[PDB]
Design a protein that fits this description.
The structure is cut from a larger assembly and holds 3 copies of chain A and 1 copy of chain B (53 residues).
Chain A lengths: L4 H11 L13 H17 L31 H16 L5 H18 L33
Helix pairs in contact in A: 1-2, 1-3, 3-4
Chain B lengths: L53
Classes of the chains: A mainly alpha (148), B little secondary structure (53).
Chain lengths: 148, 53, 158, 148
């Protein structure tokens, strides 16, 4: 199943009871367009701290559309939606509640522990390798390279 | 031909626009060229290679 | 007995007196659909932080339906319902009570207790095995087994 | 795509609902002019503490037109936008909110993480190099060069 930006923004608006399928509000499409632009901006800047996630942007001069596919896995929907809701509530001037804050924190932590990678501290390079390795027969060099 | 550094000149005069040049040879001739050089014209070396594991 | 996503969402709405049998109103199809979608996304994320617990994801583009089964053991029903209630209560603009929070935490702890790991780390790999184990030449095992290098004579990696 | 000025001040006004379409208000040209001048001043100031980020300054003696481009990459839009809002709230005598402050602080961190160089300390220049490094072939190889 696709994960489209339009319904991501719709879920973000719905989770705080702003405009849903059971609401008598008829929210304007300009708000949806602004939300899509904000999502694109935030997901573009998320290429720094959380790293790469799998998003495919609107390459070229074309503008984002609510029906355009995002490409994100379904496993990131709640996290993205909560972050977007937190970054967007200020437009309508609403104060988030502690339950929403806790849910957003939990979703973000799940995202980030899925994304986590830890490096390994490689050998220095002038550190000798012992005679047990039997160099010059089993190994060419007598010292660790320790580089790319 | 540097005007601000007289000491590194190695040619009589600077080359401006409209100067005349020619090509030494023929249209599409092919041959085996002779060579001449000094000792320190070029240098050659053979880098040793490391063993494999 | 089999358990359904419709039953789970009905439990979630009933547990906080929104669409139960002791209220002026009843359950709405919009509420049911929102609950089902929220449960779907919740377990899609739950496939990461907690272990897999046997959810049945609908294949293709078909919408999940309340009449469809879920396949969960009955022992996880309370935990799943309370987590869904916590993640969905903000839609109707209410606030959970500390007793409900404590119940949710207890159910989540019961859920997490059953799915421990305890990796039980191995030996090192260059650690000598004792002389009292009576090793042999053709069996090797002078040391605890470990990974072994790959040698190729065509790509000069060295 | 390409980013242009005026869009940033529109984002700043929209994020606090001074003039958006979520409400029924329409923006006033004085707001655009003030936002443009204050954005230019802030970008002039930012050339020292955070560092150069490729902003395109005004040329010659003409005013910064709101329709001109900025040259800033899309990732930094949220960071510039949240700082401008913080500096313009005092003009209309409003007061920020903790969620907006937290969002601004988070976005600022992303710019800082991207523009980060950690200097590496170098040898004295009178600290000797070892005898293992054969120091009879190259230039000034008896000791460490030092700086430059």
């Amino acid at each position: 199943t696709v994960l489209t930006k339009g319904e991501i923004v719709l879920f973000a608006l719905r989770k705080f009871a702003i405009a849903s399928n059971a609401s008598l509000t008829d929210v304007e499409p300009q708000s949806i367009e602004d939300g899509v632009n904000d999502l694109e901006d935030m997901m573009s800047e998320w290429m720094i701290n959380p790293g790469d996630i799998g998003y495919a942007f609107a390459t070229g001069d074309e503008q984002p559309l609510p029906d355009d596919e995002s490409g994100l896995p379904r496993k990131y929907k709640h996290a993205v939606g909560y972050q977007l809701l937190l970054r967007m509530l200020s437009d309508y001037s609403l104060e988030p509640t502690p339950q929403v804050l806790s849910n957003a924190q939990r979703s973000y932590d799940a995202l980030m522990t899925d994304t986590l990678v830890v490096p390994s501290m490689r050998r220095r390079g002038d550190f000798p390798v012992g005679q047990g390795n039997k160099y010059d027969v089993f190994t060419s060099d007598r010292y660790y390279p320790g580089d790319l | 031909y540097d005007t601000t550094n007289p000491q590194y000149n190695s040619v009589s005069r600077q080359v401006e626009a409209g100067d005349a040049v020619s090509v030494v040879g023929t249209a599409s001739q092919t041959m085996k060229p002779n060579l001449f050089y000094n000792k320190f014209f070029c240098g050659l070396g053979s880098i040793p290679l490391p063993k494999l594991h």
